[PDB]
Amino acid sequence: FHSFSFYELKNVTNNFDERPISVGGNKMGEGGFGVVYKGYVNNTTVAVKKLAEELKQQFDQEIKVMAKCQHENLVELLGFSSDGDLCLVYVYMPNGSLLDRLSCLDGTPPLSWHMRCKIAQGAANGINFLHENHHIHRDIKSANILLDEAFTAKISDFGLARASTVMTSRIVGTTAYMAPEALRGEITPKSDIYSFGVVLLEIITGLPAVDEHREPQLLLDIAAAIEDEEKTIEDYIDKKMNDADSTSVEAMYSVASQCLHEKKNKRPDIKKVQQLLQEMTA
């Protein structure tokens, strides 16, 4: 929408105070080749991404997409800055990232099963909208699903997004969430479905996708051993909730497992996911 100057964004972000908001600085998180700061423009609380070449691509990209695609489950951009490193201004997300809330970072209460089931549908409804509008996110992860005052899931980061069985030399995304074909250079909506299946797994277990100090390191692998009756979801169900139902949790593991078929073509499409996630909350 608007075109803020470096200096205003600078002045209302205490000169991009890299100290964390917890200490009473402005730094909220680090993502999309940049650092996200708390701002206060237009008498409203916002989020200001200062961008760390190809950089101008990921900037002007995140504008094009964000200008075409608005939806209840996608973050909204308010404006930007070119005047002296680039900046993007977004609507504040008071409950930050699903990752940070899943790990109860900074002491936030654990998310219920109920809140978890609505966050899953939200995230689906945001991807689907992306997929209906011939868009591939390429970076569906926990850290890219933000949470509002209502704990409504909002997908962020389209500075990697691409419009739509194609191949790319610039392989990019997050290893611990990426599909095999995406890992070898395939650009296919079917990759976004797999990543999402990792997110379903994080929602169910509360485990990060990678933990270098866990056996095994990768959540993907916990799902494989379960598919091989070497483990149970039941054993991994996050203990930090009191409302979880076995039927309901098993219904969501079901969607995940299908999302994580290593055969791109055996993966459900976003609508099947949307539908499956609905039928579970019935």
Ligand X SMILES: Cn1c(CCC(C)(C)O)nc2cc(C(C)(C)O)c(NC(=O)c3cccc(C(F)(F)F)n3)cc21
Question: Which residues share a beta bridge with 88?
Answer: 49, 80
6 or 33: CB nearest ligand X: 33
75 or 255: CB nearest ligand X: 75
Catalytic residue among 60, 83, 139, 221: 139
Going from the C-alpha of 229 to that of each of 11, 85, 198, 233, the distances in angstroms are 57, 52, 19, 10
Site for ligand X in 219-238 (CB under 6 A): none
Going from the C-alpha of 266 to that of each of 25, 140, 260, the distances in angstroms are 47, 19, 9
Give the 3-state secondary structure of 144-199.
HEEECCCCCEEECCCCCCEECCEECCCCCCCHHHCCHHHHHCEECHHHHHHHHHHH
Site for ligand X in 82-111 (CB under 6 A): 90, 92-97, 100, 106, 108
Q: How far is the CB of 34 from ligand X (least distance, A)?
A: 7
DSSP string, 48-87: EEEE--THHHHHHHHHHHHHH---TTB--EEEEE-----E
Q: How far is the CB of 83 from ligand X (least distance, A)?
A: 19
- In the chain, the amino acid numbered 201 is L
146 or 226: CB nearest ligand X: 146
Q: How far is the CB of 220 from ligand X (least distance, A)?
A: 23
Question: Does residue 192 have an active-site annotation?
Answer: no
36 or 223: CB nearest ligand X: 36
For residues 172 and 160, give the distance between their C-alpha atoms in angstroms, rounded to a whole number. Answer: 8
Q: How far is the CB of 122 from ligand X (least distance, A)?
A: 14
Query: Which positions from 146 to 165 touch ligand X by CB under 6 A, shown as an x/- string?
Result: x---------xx--------
Q: Does 197 bind ligand X (CB under 6 A)?
A: no
State the first-to-last Cα distance of the chain, in angstroms, to the nearest integer.
Answer: 39
Q: How far is the CB of 25 from ligand X (least distance, A)?
A: 12
90 — phi, psi (to 5°)? -125, 165
Asked if residue 14 belongs to a known ligand binding site, the reply is: no
174 with 192: CB under 8 angstroms?
no
Number of residues interacting with ligand X: please give it, by CB under 6 A. Answer: 20
106 or 221: CB nearest ligand X: 106
Query: Which positions from 37 to 76 touch ligand X by CB under 6 A, shown as an x/- string?
Result: ----------x-x-------------------------x-
- Give the three-class secondary structure for 215: coil
Cis peptide leading into residue 216 (ω within 30°): yes
Catalytic residues: 139
Query: Rule CB under 6 A: which residues touch ligand X?
Result: 28-29, 31, 36, 47, 49, 75, 90, 92-97, 100, 106, 108, 146, 156-157
Binding-site residues for ATP, please? 28-36, 49, 141-144, 157
